[PDB]
Amino acid sequence: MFMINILSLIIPILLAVAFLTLVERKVLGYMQLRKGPNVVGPYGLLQPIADALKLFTKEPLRPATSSISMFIIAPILALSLALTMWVPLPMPYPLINMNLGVLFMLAMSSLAVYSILWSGWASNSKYALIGALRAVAQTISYEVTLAIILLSVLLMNGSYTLSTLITTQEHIWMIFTSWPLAMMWFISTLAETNRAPFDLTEGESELVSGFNVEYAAGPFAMFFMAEYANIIMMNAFTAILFLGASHDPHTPELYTINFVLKTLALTITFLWIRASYPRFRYDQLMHLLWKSFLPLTLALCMWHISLPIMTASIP
Amino acid sequence: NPIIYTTLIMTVMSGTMLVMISSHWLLIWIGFEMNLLAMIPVLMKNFNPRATEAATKYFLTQATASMMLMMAIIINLLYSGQWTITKMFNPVAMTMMTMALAMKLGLSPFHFWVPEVTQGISLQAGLLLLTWQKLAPLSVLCQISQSINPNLMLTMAMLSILIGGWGGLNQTQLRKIMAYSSIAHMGWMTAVLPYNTTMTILNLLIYITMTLAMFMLLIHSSATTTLSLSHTWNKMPVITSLMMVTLLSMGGLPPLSGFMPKWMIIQEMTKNESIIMPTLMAMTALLNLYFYMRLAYSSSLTMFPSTNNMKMKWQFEHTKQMKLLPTMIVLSTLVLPMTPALSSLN
Amino acid sequence: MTIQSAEQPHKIPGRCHAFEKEWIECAHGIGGIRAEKECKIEFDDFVECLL
Amino acid sequence: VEIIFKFNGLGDWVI
Amino acid sequence: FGVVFRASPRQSDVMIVAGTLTNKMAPALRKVYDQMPEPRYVVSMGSCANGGGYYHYSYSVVRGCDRIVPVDIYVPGCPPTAEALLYGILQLQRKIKRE
Amino acid sequence: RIASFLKNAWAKEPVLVASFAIGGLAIILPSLSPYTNYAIRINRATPYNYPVP
Amino acid sequence: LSGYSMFAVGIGTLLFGYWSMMKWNRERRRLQIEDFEARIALMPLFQAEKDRRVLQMLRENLE
Amino acid sequence: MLTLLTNVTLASLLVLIAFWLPQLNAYSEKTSPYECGFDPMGSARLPFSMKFFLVAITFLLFDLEIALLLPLPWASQTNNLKTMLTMALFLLILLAASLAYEWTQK
Amino acid sequence: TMYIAFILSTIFVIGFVGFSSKPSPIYGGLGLIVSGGVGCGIVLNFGGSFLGLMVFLIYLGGMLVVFGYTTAMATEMYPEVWVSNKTVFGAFVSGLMMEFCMVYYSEEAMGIAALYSYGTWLVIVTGWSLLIGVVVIMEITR
Amino acid sequence: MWFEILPGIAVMAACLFIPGMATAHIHKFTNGGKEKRVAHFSYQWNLMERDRRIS
Amino acid sequence: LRMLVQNKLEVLNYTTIPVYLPEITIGAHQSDRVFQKFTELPGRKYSPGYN
Amino acid sequence: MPLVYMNIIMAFAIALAGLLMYRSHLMSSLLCLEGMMLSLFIMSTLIILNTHFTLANMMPIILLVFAACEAALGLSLLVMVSNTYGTDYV
Ligand code: SF4
C-alpha cells in the first residue's frame, strides 16, 4: 500500500500549488489595496480550478518552427522533478529515509533548470533563446553559493540525513547559531526559485514572459505549476532546516500542525517580497553574488568548519 | 606577465617531477594530467590564429591519450587489485598502456600531431615541447620496461624511424624538420627500451642536449624558413658555422658525440642477438642524416644570395645572451671519448 | 594509498586481505623476477579472491 | 564471452 | 473579476484594442491576432477604433478596428469611462455564457 | 597610516572587510583553544569497531 | 537606531547559539557513546548466530 | 523507482490530456513563431559572448571544488583533526584564492 | 532476479550509442543526461550512494549545463536530429546491433572522509591543479 | 478586509497538512503501532534481518 | 612593447625578408666582399665595449 | 568477470570510437570525451565498491575532478576556434 502513500503525497501538493496561486493573487492583491480575486468564489476559492480548466480546455498549438520532441519533453521534466524533490522530506516522518537526501535535494534542484534551457532552446524564438540563456546564468551562479552555505550549515547537525536534523534542533533552533547563512540561504532560495527581485527568467516587461512564451496552454500550466512546486518546496526545506520544533513521537501529527505553519510563514513572505522590490538586472544580479555574497559564504564557511574543533562540540 | 608565466612553467616542471617521484599509479596519471593543463597556455603566448589550432591539435591528442591510459590502469587494477607500478597483469591492458604512452611520445603511427604542432608555436615553446615533454612518458616507460611485449614496442620503434625519415626529406621550414628529427630519435630511444633502459636514458640525455643546441641557435638567429636561415652566413658567420657541426652531431658522424647513442644501442641489441633489426635501423638513420645535410647546404657550406637590406643590420650586435648555450654545444659534440662515464647512470 | 591492507581507517578489512597478506609476505628479497614463479600459487588464490 | 577477454556471465548479485 | 493582464498572446485570449489604430501599425496587429490560441476574442474600445472615431478622415488611420480583425463586443466612449468598459467585459462574459 | 585606510575600506567595501576579518580569525584562533585537545580526545573514546580482547 | 546595537544584538545571538548548541551536542555525544556500548555488548552472540547459520546453509546446499 | 514512475506517468498523462482534448484547428501563421507582432528578421543564430564562458567556466571550476568540500562533515569525526584541519582550511583558501585571482585581473 | 542493474547497464550503453553518434552537441547532451541518471542508478545499486549522487550532481548538474552554453556559441542553423543523416542514423543502428549481439550472448562514509586526514597529498595537488587551471582559463581568454 | 484572505490560506494549510499526517499514520497502520524503523546502516538492517525470521 | 623597442634587430627582424627581387637582392660575392670590408672598420670587428 | 563490467567496458569502447569517428564541428568531441570519462569513472567506482578496498573510495571523485577539469579547459580552446569561424573541424 506504499503506492497509495505516494498518491497521498502527490495529490494534496498539486492542490496546494493551485491554492497557492490563489493566495498569491490574494495577498499580493491586498498589498496593492485592491482586493484580489473574489467574485467567483465566494471568497475566490473556486477560482484556481476554473483557471486550470480554462487552460487545459484552451488549444495548445504545436509551433511550426519548434522541434517537437524537446518542446514536449521539457514540461514533463519540470513537473517531474518538481514533485520528485518532495519525497525525502521529513514531515515528521520522511516518505523515504535517504541516508543523504539533502544532497539529493540539491541534485533535483540542479537538474531543474536544465529544463529551462531546453524550454528556451526548442522554443526557437529570439526571446526564448536570450531569456533562457540569461536564466541559466543566474541559476547556476546561485547554485554554487547555494550548495556551499548549505554545507556549512550542515557541518553541525552531524550528517546529511534529514530526520537527524530534527534531533539536532530539539531546543535552540539552528537559526540563532548561524543566521547570516540563513540569510544567504534565504536569498539563494529567492533566486534559484526565480522569484521577486531576482525575476529574470520570466523576464516580464524586460522580455515579455521570457522563456515561457511560446508554450501555450497545458505545457505553460506545467511550467507555472512546477514553478510553484519549487517555491513551496524550498520554503518547506528552509523551514525544517533552520527552524526546529518540539516533537513527541506518540503524537507526530502535532508536529506537522506546527510545521505547515512555520513553512507557510515563509512562503507568504516571498509574496510580500514580490510586492516590494524592483528587479535587479542581469549584471547586478550576478555582481552581488560573485562579488559580495560569496566571500562571506567562504569566511563563514571556514568559521563553521572551525567552531566544532575549538568548541570541542563535534556532532 | 613573467610572474605568471614562470608559475606555469614551474608547475610544468612540478607536473613532470611528480611523475618521476610517485610510485602510485594514480599520482602518475595526475602527473600527466596536471602537466597538460599547464602545457597548453604556454603555447598560446603571443597568440596567433594559427597558434590556436596548434594548441587544439595538441590538447586533443594528449587528452585522448590520457584517457586510454587511465582506462588501461583501471583494467590492470581489475585483474590484480594493485596500484604500485611494477609488472602489469593483463596483456589486453598492457598493450593499451603502451599505446597511450606511444601517443605521449608522439611515436608513429600516432605521430602526425607532432610535426604540425611544432609549426604552430615559437621556437621557445617549441624547444620546450620537444624536450621537457619527452621526459615524463619515458619516465614511466623506464619503470614498466619489465613487462612490455617487445614485439609491439619494436614495431613502433622502427616505424618511428622510417616515418621519422621520409617525412624529413620533404620540408623547407626548419621547425617542421626539427619535428621529424625528434620523431626519429624517439624511435632510437624506445627501440632499446625493452632490452636495457640505461642505454635509453643515455640517448635521452644526448638528444636533449642536441636539440637544446639547435633551438638555442635558431633563437640566436631568429631563422625559420630555410631561406631565412640562408642569409645568416654574412651576419654572424660563426653561428651558421656552428649549425653545421651540431647538425652533423644529429647525423651521428662517428667522431661526433651523437654517434655515442647509436653505437651503444647497437651494442646492446647485439647481445640479444636480434642482429637484423639494428642493421635496418642504422641504415635508415642515414636517410635521417641526409636532410640535415641538405639543410647544411642551404646555410653554412654555401652562400645563398644576401638581400641588401641586411647591411644596416650589420651594425647591431645581438643581445640578451643565453648563458646556457655554449656548454650545450660543446657537450653535444666533443664528449665522445667520455662514453664510459655512461655507467654512472648504472 | 597503495595495497589492499596497509592500515585503513577504522581498521576496515579489505575483502581479500588474507590472500594478499600471505602473498606479500612471500614477496621480498625474491624480488620481482623469481617472484612470478615461486609465489604464483598465492597470487592465484588471490586472483580467485578478487574475481 | 569470447570477445576481447572472458565475461563470466550470470547475474550481478553473485559477486 | 479574475481577468489579469498578461503579455504574450500565447498565454492570453481576449484582446483589448484601446486607442487609435494607424496604417503602419495594422500588420503587426493582424500578426498578433493570428498568433493567439483558440478560442480567441477581441474587444474594440472607445470611439477610437470602432471606426476611426475622431480621426475618421486621415490617410494613416484604418477606420474601424473591424477591418483587420473580427471584433466581439464594442465599448463606445472617448475615452470610455473605465467603468463603462467594465460593463463591457461583463457583457462579454454574458456572451461567452451563451456559447 | 595603515590603520587609516581601514576606515577607508570599511567605508568602501564592508562586506569584504568582515569577510577577511572572520575569515582569518577562524584560522588563527583554533590553536589557542584548550578544548581542541579534548575535541580530538572525544573521538578516541567512541568505538564503531569492536574492542577485541 | 544605532549601528553598534545591530552588531551587538547579532553577535550576542550568535554566542548564545554556539553555547547552547555546544551543551546539547556534547550531551548527545554521550548518549551516542553509551549506545555504542549497547551494541558492542549485543554483538558476540550475533556473531555466533550468523556463524552457525552460515555453516548450516553451506552444509545444506552441499548436500 | 516506483515514485519516479508514478510521477513521470502522471506528468505524461497531463500532457496527453493537454493535447488530445481541445480538438480544434491549427493552421499556418497561427503556428508561426512569436516576435512581438512583426515577423522575425531571421532564425536564432549566434548570441556570442566571451562574457558567458569567462565566468561560467569559473562556475564549473568551483563546482568541482565544492565536490571536494562535501566529504567534510564526515571527515570531521576522524581520529586526528590536526592532520585534517589544515586541509579543511586549505582548499577553502585556494577556492578564495582562485576567486581572488579572478577578482582583480578583471 | 530483476537483473535491474544489468538492464540499467544496457540502457547505459545505448545511452552511449545515441551519444557517441554525433548529431549536434545538444542532443548528445541529452545522451549524457540519460546515461548520467542511468549511471548514478547503477552505482547506487552497490550502495556507493554518495558517489552516484556526486556524478548525478557534479557532472550532470554542472557539465551538461555549460555545454548548454557552448551550443549557444556554436549551434549553426538547422542542427541535425539523429534521423537527419544517413551516417549518423546509420551509426546509431550500428551501435544497436552490436550491443544487442552482446545481450544475445557505511564503508563509503569514512572511506571518503579519509581523504582529508589520511590523504593530505592528493588534496595538495588537486588544490594546486584546479587553481592553476583557473589561471589557464585566464591566460587563454584574456 | 484582510482577514478575508484567510479562507484562501487555510485551504493551503490543510492540503499541506494531509501528507504529513497521511504518511505518519500509514506507518503505524502497517507496522502495528511500531512507528516504522529506519535502517541507515548495515547493522540495523541486520537487526531486521534477525527479526522477521524470529517472529 | 617596451621589450620590442630594445634589441632593435628584432624590430628589423623582418626587414630582411627573402623574396629575391633582382634590384634588392645581392649575389653572394658582392655581399661576402662588402661585409668583408665592413669588418675592416675600427669599431666593427667586435662588440663595441670590447674593441 | 561479471557481465555488467563487460558492458561498461564496451560503453567505453563506443565512447572512444565515437571520439575518433570524429566529424564536423568538434564540440561533439568534447562531449564524447566526457562520456569516455564517465565510463571510466563508473567502471572504477564499481570496483572500489566491490572489494571493500576502502581508501580507494577517495579516488573516483578525485579522478573525476581532473578529468572534468581538463574538459573544462577544452571548451575554452573551442571558444577561440569558434571565435574566428563559427566552429567546424573541417
Ligand atoms: S477615444 Fe478619445 S482618446 Fe481614445 S483615441 Fe479616440 S479620441 Fe483619443
List the grid coordinates of A61. 498549438
Handedness of CA G19, G20, G24, G25 (dihedral sign): negative
Q: Which of I6, I102, I105 sits opposite D12 (nearest CB)?
A: I6
Question: Are chains B and I touching, using the cut-off of 8 Å on CB pairs and a minimum of 3 such pairs?
Answer: yes
Rounded CA separation L82/F32 (Å):
55
Rounded CA separation B206/B342 (Å):
11
Rounded CA separation I130/H94 (Å):
9
Q: What is the 3-state secondary structure (H, E, C) of L63-82?
A: HHHHHHHHHHHHHHHHHHHH
Question: E75 — phi, psi (to 5°)?
Answer: -130, 80
Contact between A177 and G21 using a beta-carbon 8 Å cutoff: yes
Q: Find, among B316, B132, B296, the residue nearest to B230 by Cα.
A: B296
**Residue found by looking up cell 620503434 in the block:** B157
Nearest residue of J to residue G43 by CA position?
A: J43
Instruction: Compute CA A216 distance to the chain's CA centroid, rounded to the nearest angstrom.
Output: 23
List the grid coordinates of A182. 540563513
Nearest residue of D to residue I102 by CA position?
A: D1
Handedness of CA I1, I2, I5, I6 (dihedral sign): positive
Radius of gyration of chain D (CA): 9
Instruction: Compute CA K22 distance to the chain's CA centroid, rounded to the nearest angstrom.
Output: 19
Radius of gyration of chain E (CA): 13
Q: Do the beta carbons of residue L43 and residue B74 sit within 8 Å?
A: yes
* Chain E residues closer than 8 Å to A40 by CB: 2
Q: Do the beta carbons of residue A63 and residue A123 sit within 8 Å?
A: yes
Rounded CA separation A29/A32 (Å):
5
Question: I136 — phi, psi (to 5°)?
Answer: -65, -40
List the grid coordinates of F53. 580482547
Question: How does DSSP classify residue B84?
Answer: B
- Give the distance from residue B343's alpha carbon to the nearest chain C alpha carbon, in angstroms: 23
Q: What is the pairing mode between strands E74-75 and K25-26? A: unpaired
Q: Find, among B106, B186, B104, B177, the residue nearest to B140 by Cα.
A: B104
Q: Find, among G7, L60, B277, the residue nearest to I43 by Cα.
A: L60
Cα dihedral B333, B338, B342, B344, rounded to 10, equals: -130
Taking the CB of residue B64, how many other CB atoms lie within 10 A of it?
20
User: Structural domain boundaries of chain I?
Assistant: 4-142
- Chain A, residues 166-195, CB within 8 A of chain G, namely 167-168, 170-172, 176-179
Q: Do the beta carbons of residue B239 and residue B217 sit within 8 Å?
A: yes
Which residues, 6+ apart, have CB-to-CB distance to B201 below 8 Å? B142, B345
Return the CATH class of domain H1-105: mainly alpha
List the grid coordinates of C18. 588474507
Nearest residue of J to residue A257 by CA position?
A: J17
- Method of determination used here: cryo-EM
K31 touches chain B (CB under 8 A): yes
Amino acid A309 reads I
List the grid coordinates of G23. 551543551
Question: Are chains L and F touching, using the cut-off of 8 Å on CB pairs and a minimum of 3 such pairs?
Answer: no
| 3-class DSSP assignment, residue E74 | strand
- Could you tell me the end-to-end alpha-carbon distance of chain H, in angstroms, rounded to an integer? 47
Q: Do the beta carbons of residue L14 and residue I20 sit within 8 Å?
A: yes
**Residue found by looking up cell 498549438 in the block:** A61
Amino acid B269 reads M
Check whether the bond before E39 is cis (ω within 30° of 0).
yes
Rounded CA separation B297/B227 (Å):
11
Amino acid A272 reads W
* Chain C residues closer than 8 Å to B22 by CB: none
Rounded CA separation C20/D12 (Å):
24
Rounded CA separation F10/B251 (Å):
69
User: Structural domain boundaries of chain H?
Assistant: 1-105
Radius of gyration of chain A (CA): 20
Question: How does DSSP classify residue B24?
Answer: B
Integer CA distances (angstroms), J36 to A110, G40, J22, J30, in order: 31, 24, 14, 8
Taking the CB of residue G61, how many other CB atoms lie within 10 A of it?
7
| 3-class DSSP assignment, residue E97 | coil
Angle at L89 between CA L84 and CA L90, to 5 degrees: 95
Taking the CB of residue H17, how many other CB atoms lie within 10 A of it?
11
- Give the distance from residue B34's alpha carbon to the nearest chain D alpha carbon, in angstroms: 32
* Chain A residues closer than 8 Å to G15 by CB: none
Handedness of CA A284, A290, A295, A300 (dihedral sign): positive
Beta bridge partners of E17: E44
Taking CA atoms only, the protein residue closest to ligand 1 atom 1 is E78
Query: Which own/partner pairs from B143-149 qualify as long-range (CB within 8 Å, at least 24 positions apart)?
Result: B143/B85, B144/B85, B144/B87, B144/B88, B144/B97, B145/B193, B145/B194, B145/B197, B146/B86, B146/B87, B146/C32, B147/B87, B147/B88, B147/B94, B148/B94, B148/B98, B148/B193, B148/B194, B149/B91, B149/B94, B149/B95, B149/B98
Rounded CA separation A237/A230 (Å):
10
Amino acid L30 reads L
Q: Find, among H52, H104, F19, the residue nearest to A184 by Cα.
A: F19
Rounded CA separation B167/L81 (Å):
28
Amino acid A291 reads K
| 3-class DSSP assignment, residue B56 | helix
Integer CA distances (angstroms), I16 to B31, D7, I96, L11, in order: 29, 20, 10, 6
List the grid coordinates of A13. 501538493
Q: Do the beta carbons of residue J4 and residue A34 sit within 8 Å?
A: no
Amino acid L64 reads L
Beta bridge partners of E45: E75
* Chain I residues closer than 8 Å to L22 by CB: 22
Q: Do the beta carbons of residue A44 and residue A37 sit within 8 Å?
A: yes
Beta bridge partners of A130: none
**Category of I23 on φ-ψ map: left (φ > 0), alpha (ψ -120 to 50) or beta:** beta
Contact between G40 and F45 using a beta-carbon 8 Å cutoff: no
Q: What is the pairing mode between strands K25-26 and E43-45? A: unpaired
Question: E55 CA distance to ligand 1 centroid (A)?
Answer: 9
Task: Out of E16, E17, E20, give the residue to mutate to test ligand 1, the one with the largest number of ligand atoms within 8 Å of its CB.
Answer: E20
Radius of gyration of chain B (CA): 20
Return the exposure string of E4-41: e unless at least 16 CB atoms fall within 10 Å of the residue's CB, then b.
eeeebbbbbebbebeebbeeeebeebebbbbbbbeebb
Rounded CA separation A105/A112 (Å):
11
List the grid coordinates of L83. 571565435
**Category of A4 on φ-ψ map: left (φ > 0), alpha (ψ -120 to 50) or beta:** alpha
Interface of B with K (CB under 8 A): 222, 225, 227-228, 230-231, 234-235, 303-320
- Give the distance from residue K50's alpha carbon to the nearest chain B alpha carbon, in angstroms: 12
Rounded CA separation B100/B152 (Å):
13
Which alpha helices (H) appear in E1-99, and where do they start and end? 26-35, 82-96
Resolution in A: 5.4
Q: Find, among B60, B155, B74, the residue nearest to B108 by Cα.
A: B155
Taking the CB of residue J3, how many other CB atoms lie within 10 A of it?
6
Question: How does DSSP classify residue E53?
Answer: G
How many beta-carbon pairs below 8 A join chains A and F?
A: 56
| 3-class DSSP assignment, residue A308 | helix
Amino acid C35 reads A
Question: How does DSSP classify residue I57?
Answer: I
**Residue found by looking up cell 540499467 in the block:** I8
Rounded CA separation A16/A94 (Å):
19
Handedness of CA I80, I85, I90, I93 (dihedral sign): positive
Q: Is E65 annotated as a binding residue?
A: no
- Give the distance from residue B112's alpha carbon to the nearest chain C alpha carbon, in angstroms: 37
Q: Do the beta carbons of residue E64 and residue E56 sit within 8 Å?
A: no
Question: I103 — phi, psi (to 5°)?
Answer: -65, -35
Taking the CB of residue I124, how many other CB atoms lie within 10 A of it?
14
Q: Do the beta carbons of residue A20 and residue A261 sit within 8 Å?
A: no
Taking the CB of residue K43, how many other CB atoms lie within 10 A of it?
8
Beta bridge partners of B195: none
Question: E43 — phi, psi (to 5°)?
Answer: -145, 110
Q: Do the beta carbons of residue L67 and residue L39 sit within 8 Å?
A: no
Q: Find, among E99, H29, E70, E36, the residue nearest to A60 by Cα.
A: E36
| 3-class DSSP assignment, residue B306 | strand
Q: Do the beta carbons of residue B291 and residue B169 sit within 8 Å?
A: yes
List the grid coordinates of L78. 573551442
Amino acid H76 reads S
Q: Find, among B184, B216, B97, the residue nearest to B147 by Cα.
A: B97
Q: Find, among A79, A297, G56, the residue nearest to H12 by Cα.
A: A79
Beta bridge partners of B24: B84
* Chain I residues closer than 8 Å to L68 by CB: 58-59, 62-63
Q: Which of H15, H52, H69 sits opposite A151 (nearest CB)?
A: H69
List the grid coordinates of B228. 631565412
**Residue found by looking up cell 580467485 in the block:** C48
Angle at I83 between CA I77 and CA I89, to 5 degrees: 120
- Could you tell me the end-to-end alpha-carbon distance of chain B, in angstroms, rounded to an integer? 42
List the grid coordinates of C38. 615461486
Rounded CA separation H96/A295 (Å):
7
Taking the CB of residue H105, how many other CB atoms lie within 10 A of it?
11
Which atom belonging to ligand 1 lies closest to the Cα atom of E46? 1
| CATH 1.20.120.1200 matches I4-142 | yes
Contact between I66 and H74 using a beta-carbon 8 Å cutoff: no
H25 touches chain E (CB under 8 A): yes
Task: Out of E16, E22, E47, E63, give the residue to mutate to test ligand 1, the one with the largest number of ligand atoms within 8 Å of its CB.
Answer: E47
Q: Is E78 annotated as a binding residue?
A: yes
Rounded CA separation A312/A304 (Å):
12
Question: K25 — phi, psi (to 5°)?
Answer: -70, 150
Instruction: Compute CA A148 distance to the chain's CA centroid, rounded to the nearest angstrom.
Output: 17
Domains and CATH numbers, chain L: 3-90 (1.10.287.3510)
Question: H63 CA distance to ligand 1 centroid (A)?
Answer: 58
Amino acid B38 reads A
Return the exposure string of B255-284: e unless at least 16 CB atoms fall within 10 Å of the residue's CB, then b.
ebbbbbbbebbbebbeeeeeeebbeebbeb
Question: E48 CA distance to ligand 1 centroid (A)?
Answer: 5
Question: Are chains L and J touching, using the cut-off of 8 Å on CB pairs and a minimum of 3 such pairs?
Answer: no
Rounded CA separation B161/B144 (Å):
22
Taking the CB of residue B44, how many other CB atoms lie within 10 A of it?
21
Ligand 1 in reach of E44 Cβ (< 6 A): no
**Residue found by looking up cell 585483474 in the block:** B79
